[PDB]
């Protein structure tokens, strides 16, 4: 922690490169248009939001990387990736309009886009598809996602897939959005990989929403101390230009004393006082402090301004980054939220909610930046514009031209043809097994013959978050190799022999450690570098299924937003198959987490062939002519068993989410036999223990997804009820079902079953599930105990019959007694 | 940083205070069965899992701990908070075996628990609720969770509530544990709010899982690096007392800088192969280094200790961190990984997953370690036991003695008796509002209630994230505080006005910023002081509900296995009535993932005289003479609308999930109407358009909670399959509902009304929803769009009679058209 000043002095200071004044210009109708967005939508009275403090207090930060940084996407890459600050989107929007890349008519549509020509609350590419690139308005997201941005972009030119050593990252962030655990938490990766491309700019305005960060303290040197820490090049940009004539007229040291013992609360109090104020409570503190201004008029205090505010000391900080090598690079701008904005919220606890203000706020505003807007057009909240030929339209153009271009923009998607394998390519996965494998080792295999396809086999980037080994892939990396920038600087102790621990600047996966968030991140990066650089990387990320979406759900909804292409595979999942590892491992409700994103496409297959199918179906969708925007979630097993062929024609269903997979005969009934993932085997084996032991016969089903099932019945009703004279339409499910009574049973909740309750065509329609925490034990006294098991799918069957009147009650009874359940035991969702 | 060499010099070093031969005869033993353990597992052969290497290599820094520091639980205080490593726990049972506080049938039960008389694989206190305290095995959730523990503990002392003066929290970690953001995302709060009861112990063995944390770097300075900038005192425990000598002797500086540049993957190799590898490799890096082991042998540089297997130097860390204060201390413990295991583990990239071992590799466990067992026995995995009277046995119990007792144990439940407040302390919010009001309002008005109660009122623990002044709670920071260990020591913006930011040492609002994690593990430290200080904290977290499990799910589970009685409140939800925030923002779906955690009650009341009639059942139901292990999520709104008395004998109902609103008649047909939260005003506008406009009438519903009616169905129907021969139980749902044709409407997804489906006793059941992703309009554009309001439920409520030939299929083209409703607008979720 270094003197509460500037890193970069005066003497080491660069020459600032534009016109000022000329800039200034320009930057006072961004900031009036942007504020005249925001009062507009706020005159509605439709409660649609909006804030102005924030933008007020980086606007000008922004302004000197738009003059003189921001690289737009061009000819040989995406350019820089910025990720703005969610909340000042009305000021880039008062910006592209100012470029004339938004209408008027967008601007006053400004948070309501149901009817479209409107524009989102916040960066959303999901709904501007072409403007918008990375969601950052949930906090704490952003610096992380950029951190592997950064290093996924570094990573595409150690692999020599692109050039992309001309783009910087820069991450837009809040003071008060640092306390995020996401925030801080891996900013030492940036070290060990020495993200040289990525710039973190945190707007220091010593507040957040409810008041200061912390006003008994000081966040700027709390952040510089934990960055400078985790090894990043710290920059302070504390004070202006008109502080330097002031610092070195100080040969007692005592101003620097004064500004290192005082505290962020009184601080941000001063800005929202005036001169007199600072006089007496500032540099009234001391009699040395006191007489440098005593000189000086109160009017000449209130002057001085913050190092957020000045171009040109921002400018030191953003040019010094650009020039340095080797590791990360922080800047703290110190600045002051709601400036400018006087009475309504300059330096108030208050400012971040201020949406709405008097003509009298309006007219201060106008004469504070001096708007060129006259009395007579003001009360009609205009926008400013600049036209051809006016030296504003003429510089502001200029300088993005010389930079490539405007930003942001988006292009969804990409130009490439890929030669995609075939089904044909996946063809020994869809005949019989002679070992018993699982579906985990089905998609390492599936992983294999990818990494045979010339058009993709470099483009498929596998991720893990350590447990490789328990996926039985450690072997891959001496194959493909651990990804390492100017790594193995030692021997493996794995070295002598077959699977050792490579690691190699050209290593192809992905390996980060202990870190679902970090990982999901950089899967993320790859999932979307089809639009972000135009290069289509295909990403496999498998881990632990329980600390997929539980963990990292905020970033998959993210994701969904981004419009992210790839492959989650939650691996060992199942309540009951991951046995004794117990209560937060066993997993038997992520794809209830998973089915609430609308973009993501989820399965639970339980043979080798299915899961060949489905990740087929899906390169085909996402990264093939169709370039559908949906990611998958797969999830897959620990657990070896028989593997069966696939049944002819057997395709459609599997990729639509249910086929049947045989009839049983059977003289005394009939019933419908579900079953998913682990659990289907368990469900044949009741479906033979039925026709065996009671003459009843059966449709087996496999249930490769439960949730587009569910999705296309929900589909189909809500046609049905928007079309009340057409035929009605019958969901895939119904289609394939009949009517005899039914019985489901999975490795999940019920739920997971119950979904397509609506939509099943029988009367009755019995689901198992394993609801309740989950505890350690083998497979088979767990699958007794949440009562999904056989036995209990042969006892749900026979209890439907018995209703029918089609058997005797006794005889349930009596099967009940013949498996040993206990009917009498706690509700394991209660045990 | 400082030098790869121990932060406490030799002659700065505390004398040891214990017997070492006697501790390690008894160290030795616990060992050993920590191993039998998981060998005898691995024997049954049912996939059961467990480790071994990791408790090996950090199994003399517990011991210290057991035998000189950790306090048990006592009359005074819970003792010291000790969040054990998860995956070291079969050490733990080890000891408690030796300790006599577990059998030798329970150690042969080691993961297999469904029946029993077992042991869970980690730390779980829903399935060990009188052993253990804290969910630890997902990795980061112990480092915040010991955080806002620590801060929680100063927080009850400072307002006054309970000395914890003499509790010291001590996370155990890994190293490769630390790379999960939430590890270290947080600990600069430690020195926020000087938390010097707070003790970090990092076991770094150099490796993780799949292999070395950071094999081309040195974590454990990267870690000094980090937590040093971060305000923390750190201890390094590097090497043991053999090094003495050789550091001292060392007058050129040589020993130290090898040390320095060496890095992890070196370091790690080392520790598995032998002297001579050593000697050549690292000491004969330089001729200075050479020299000072020239004279020694192969087998004495062998002999060279890492600090973390050193009881002296282990305590003398310990020992300071307990005399160090204002601030937090982190000890960075230097082990091998598969510690003494030789062979089959020691310093070997596959290490972490042994779970079993040939004789060669036991017999070499049992001549490393002095095991008093012959070569004959081994083969039996013999438990190692200490007899009465037995030198090893009165120690092993004298030092715990002196230590309050053994550890870790728990109680479930807290003596005294609060005077909780009635319901009809709750009147006013029970009658009809003058002003339209929200549910938000009605909570706040709810939480002033229990503020009067002379019982409870200090009790009471309001958490935010930065989000008080969007729930208008910001009167309350000059009401109760907002709490600040440091006071407030500069003078407030807003000081001279109401509604003044307050910060004070007793205050009792916790503010944590924009970090939901934090405020979570801030939530569940006082939702169970009831167990972990016998002091029953009733915890009020309010944030925007998209936020909730979304982004904290995997803590949220952990909740639940920690037992934590308490409530979480999410603010501004529904995916319509935060209508102007977006994607991000409108939840429409954290009901679908509250609902897959066992022992969280979820509601999403209309009113404010059920907001009311939910918390006081809450407030009895956890922290009443029942004491239920559950805690409560409540989804609050930030609409105002008229708020109607509540009707006479409805309270039950409002608990249940359901209760009847009123029934409207109409002789052109018939149908039900159940609508939840924000919804529920539009469901009835529909009742009245249906009645007035078509003649149909109908039973209105409110939903409190669709998933407790879900739940209780599920227990209905497997209770009724398991008596097949008994009277069958009724849903509640069923109970309430009748026949007539029935339509759903609620601000969540389908799913969330859909699941009760089977339940329901009517024939036709349509539910409307908010599938799909979020976007930026006003409640009504958005109610529109995501086809719920009124007109929908119209035309869904028509069409259902039009199948039943109750009306012309005409009239509902009608109506659609009537209500401008497009049938061929896209899918909601699609958009
Ligand atoms: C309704 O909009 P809002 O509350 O103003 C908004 C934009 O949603 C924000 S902005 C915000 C405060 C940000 O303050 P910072 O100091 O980081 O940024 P600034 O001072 O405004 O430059 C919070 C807590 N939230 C709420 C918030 C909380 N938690 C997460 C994870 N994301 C959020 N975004
Ligand atoms: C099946 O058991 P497991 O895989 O051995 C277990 C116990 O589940 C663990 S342990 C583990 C490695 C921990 O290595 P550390 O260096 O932190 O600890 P140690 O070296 O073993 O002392 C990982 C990645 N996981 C998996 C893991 C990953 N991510 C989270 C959030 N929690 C986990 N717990
Ligand atoms: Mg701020
Ligand atoms: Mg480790």
């Known amino acids: 922690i270094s003197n509460y000043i500037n890193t970069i002095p005066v003497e080491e200071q660069p020459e600032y490169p ?39 207090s980086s606007a000008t930060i922004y302004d000197v990387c738009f003059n003189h940084f921001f690289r737009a996407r061009n000819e040989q890459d995406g350019g820089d990736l910025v990720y703005f600050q969610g909340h000042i989107s009305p000021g880039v929007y008062a910006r592209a309009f100012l470029e004339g890349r938004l209408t008027q008519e967008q601007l006053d549509n400004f948070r309501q886009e149901v009817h479209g020509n409107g524009l989102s609350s916040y960066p959303h590419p999901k709904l501007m598809p072409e403007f918008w690139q990375f969601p950052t308005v949930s906090m704490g997201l952003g610096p992380i996602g950029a951190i592997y941005q950064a290093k996924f972009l570094k990573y595409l030119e150690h692999r020599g897939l692109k050039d992309t050593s001309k783009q910087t990252v820069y991450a837009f962030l809040g003071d008060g959005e640092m306390d995020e655990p996401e925030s801080k938490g891996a900013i030492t990766i940036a070290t060990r990989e020495k993200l040289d491309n990525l710039v973190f700019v945190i707007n220091c305005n010593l507040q957040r929403l409810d008041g200061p960060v912390t006003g008994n303290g000081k966040i700027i040197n709390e952040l510089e101390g934990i960055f400078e820490g985790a090894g990043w090049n710290v920059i302070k940009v504390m004070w202006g230009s008109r502080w330097d004539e002031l610092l070195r007229k100080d040969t007692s040291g005592k101003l620097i004393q004064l500004m290192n013992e005082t505290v962020d609360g009184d601080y941000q109090t001063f800005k929202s006082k005036d001169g007199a104020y600072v006089r007496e409570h ?26 957020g505010h000045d171009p040109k000391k921002i400018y030191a900080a953003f040019k010094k980054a650009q020039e340095t090598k080797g590791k990360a690079t922080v800047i703290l701008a110190h600045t002051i939220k709601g400036y400018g904005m006087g009475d309504a919220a300059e330096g108030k606890n208050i400012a971040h909610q201020v949406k709405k203000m008097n003509m009298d706020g309006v007219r201060h505003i106008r004469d504070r930046f001096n708007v060129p807007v006259s009395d007579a057009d003001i009360e009609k909240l205009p926008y400013i514009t600049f036209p051809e030929g006016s030296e504003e339209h003429t510089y502001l153009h200029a300088q993005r031209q010389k930079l490539h271009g405007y930003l942001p923009s988006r292009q969804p998607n990409f130009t490439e043809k890929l030669e995609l394998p075939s089904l044909q390519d996946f063809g020994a996965l869809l005949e019989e097994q002679s070992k018993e494998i699982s579906t985990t080792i089905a998609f390492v295999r599936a992983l294999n013959v990818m990494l045979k396809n010339k058009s993709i086999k470099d483009r498929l980037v596998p991720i893990i978050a350590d447990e490789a080994r328990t996926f039985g892939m450690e072997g891959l990396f001496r194959q493909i ?4 920038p100017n790594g193995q600087q ?32 950089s899967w993320l990066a790859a999932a979307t570098s089809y639009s972000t650089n135009n290069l289509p990387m295909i990403p496999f990320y498998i881990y632990y299924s329980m600390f997929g979406f539980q963990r990292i759900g905020d970033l998959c909804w993210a994701a969904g ?26 997993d038997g409700h992520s794809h209830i987490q998973s089915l609430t994103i609308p973009n993501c496409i989820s399965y639970d297959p339980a043979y080798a062939y299915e899961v060949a199918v489905i990740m087929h179906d899906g390169l085909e969708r996402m990264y093939g002519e169709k370039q ?36 049983i005969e059977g003289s005394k009934g009939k019933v419908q036999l579900l079953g998913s993932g682990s659990i289907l085997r368990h469900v044949r084996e009741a479906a033979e223990i039925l026709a065996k032991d009671y003459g009843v016969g059966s449709d087996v089903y496999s249930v490769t997804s439960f949730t587009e099932l569910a999705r296309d019945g929900q589909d189909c009703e809500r046609w049905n009820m928007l079309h009340p004279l057409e035929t009605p339409r019958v969901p895939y499910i119904a289609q394939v079902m009949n009517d005899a009574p039914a019985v489901a049973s999975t490795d999940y909740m019920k739920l997971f079953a119950e979904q397509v309750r609506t939509y099943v065509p029988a009367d009755d329609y019995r689901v198992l599930g394993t609801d309740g925490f989950g505890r350690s034990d083998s497979r088979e006294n767990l699958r007794h105990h949440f009562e999904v098991d056989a036995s209990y799918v042969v006892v749900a069957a026979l209890g439907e019959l018995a209703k029918r009147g089609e058997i005797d009650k006794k005889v ?8 040993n359940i206990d009917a009498d035991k706690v509700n394991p969702r209660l045990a």
Chains 1, 2 share one sequence.
């Open 18 to 56: 534009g016109n000022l004044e000329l800039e200034r210009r320009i930057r006072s109708a961004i900031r009036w248009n942007a504020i005249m967005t925001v009062l507009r939508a706020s005159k509605k009275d439709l409660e649609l939001g909006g804030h102005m403090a924030s933008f007020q």
């Open 282 to 307: 500032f540099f009234g503190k001391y009699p040395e402090t006191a007489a440098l201004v005593a000189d000086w008029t109160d009017e000449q205090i209130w002057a001085l301004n913050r190092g």
């Open 481 to 484: 190799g651990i990804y390492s």
């Open 490 to 521: 030692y021997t493996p102790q794995d070295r002598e022999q077959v699977a050792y621990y490579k690691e190699d600047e050209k290593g192809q996966i992905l390996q980060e450690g202990i870190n679902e968030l970090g990982a999901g991140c």
């Open 561 to 586: 937003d981004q419009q992210a292409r790839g492959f989650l595979i939650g691996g060992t999942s199942g309540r009951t198959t991951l046995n004794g590892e117990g209560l937060q491992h066993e």
């Open 628 to 663: 559908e925007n949906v990611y998958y979630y797969i999830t897959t097993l620990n657990e070896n068993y028989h593997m069966p062929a696939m049944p002819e024609g057997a395709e459609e269903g599997i990729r639509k989410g249910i086929y049947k997979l045989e009839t």
């Open 812 to 819: 349930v009874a009596d099967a009940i007694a013949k498996f």
